[PDB]
Design a protein around this nucleic acid. Structure first.
Lengths: 94, 96
DNA sequence: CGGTGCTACAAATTGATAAGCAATGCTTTTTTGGC
DNA sequence: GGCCAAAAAAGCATT
DNA sequence: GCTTATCAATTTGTAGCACC
């Protein structure tokens, strides 16, 4: 399911909500989640999961193709931790 | 931290929607992601990231407190793979 | 709009196994905006 | 909502 | 080819949010 397919599905189900509105909302929410993480703030959705940021110390990386070295400054990367319900519903193996 | 309440708010202000719709929409949003996932389908949200499913076999584990070796039962877990666009907007983030 | 009880959630701890990734040119998929 | 060409993003290699 | 994540059981303090 792609971003668009997500919109269509939501739009289909709801008959009392304009599709164009659903499109705006979805796009907005995501951009909201994005800015939040880029601001250094975490996301907490009880039941679904939580988005945070993990630090990556500086390291003398490499160019996997040429082997040449490359200095890499410290940085932050996104990290998601599935909520209970999400874990349970996703794990088909009882 | 960011919550559905806050998200519902932004939808209320920026897009001017009823606090009812701005509330349900949020729930539906995540519920639709959960659904797609429980049905074994991959979720690819361009501009953000992908929620892929991986099937992990069983492996050796233990009781962190004591040390009682216990096998981590096989299972299907949900993972998140952020895209470059998102990764770039966060690499220089300052933990608030 | 607002107080709050219920619980999911965060942090921690050890150690074997799994997952992810530094650069970047080329390919493929998804989004975009006019009609 | 569909067509389509171009842009944007992601995917591949290997990441 | 190396760094980071995954997860077990148990406790303890925190906070999302459904339900009044």
């Amino acid at each position: 399911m792609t971003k668009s397919e997500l919109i269509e599905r939501l739009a289909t189900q709801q008959s009392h909500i304009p599709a164009k509105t659903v499109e705006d909302a979805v796009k907005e929410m995501l951009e909201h989640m994005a800015s939040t993480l880029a601001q250094g703030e975490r996301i907490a959705i009880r039941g679904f999961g939580s988005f945070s940021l993990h630090y990556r110390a500086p390291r003398t990386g490499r160019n996997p193709k040429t082997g040449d070295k490359v200095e890499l400054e410290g940085k932050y990367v996104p990290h998601f931790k599935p909520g209970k319900e999400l874990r349970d519903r996703a794990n088909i193996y009882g | 931290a960011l919550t559905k309440a806050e998200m519902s708010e932004y939808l209320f202000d920026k897009l001017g929607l009823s606090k009812r719709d701005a509330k349900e929409l949020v729930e539906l949003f995540f519920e639709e992601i959960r659904r797609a996932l429980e049905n074994g389908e991959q979720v690819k949200l361009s501009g953000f990231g992908n929620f892929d499913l991986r099937d992990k076999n069983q492996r050796p584990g233990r009781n962190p407190k004591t040390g009682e070796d216990i096998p981590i039962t096989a299972r299907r877990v949900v993972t998140f793979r952020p895209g470059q666009k998102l990764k770039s907007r966060v690499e220089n983030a300052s933990p608030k």
